[PDB]
């Protein structure tokens with residue numbers, strides 16, 4: 796049961812890539828899906844069973860069909876946990892017709908090895924693991940938030956937090 800959009804206050808409270816936002820237990824997942832049978836399109840928001848597993852259950856039980864290809868993009872407030880990463884990498888291993896890109900606002904909560912191995916496993920199976928930049932936050936603000944046509948005001952330190960998280964992710968996936 797995915798909702799169409801979230802409240803702007805919720806979006807700013809959960810998608811901040813700052814330090815305080817690491818105390819946020821909730822996890823949110825925006826998604827865009829291109830269904831190519833040769834073509835339909837979907838998009839929506841899941842929240843936390845974590846949000847990744849929710850998307851897998853809904854998508855597998857309600858959308859999936861052979862002779863159909865899927866281009867899926869996730870915008871997650873948290874990087875997937877090792878269990879979710881194993882389940883998603885397993886799912887992709889068994890569904891070659893599904894191509895997944897994961898863009899995350901925050902990495903792991905602490906410097907755990909099994910989180911790094913989860914991300915690396917996701918990448919070995921063909922999933923694109925990336926950090927959310929300003930363009931990604933703006934896109935989410937336009938397409939998954941009741942923005943009331945107000946423009947996206949980024950928070951302080953967004954870009955430097957991106958550069959740090961992207962250097963870290965480069966060190967994880969190399």
Ligand SMILES: [Zn+2]
Pocket residue numbers: 845847875876877878879880
């Ligand atoms: Zn998880």
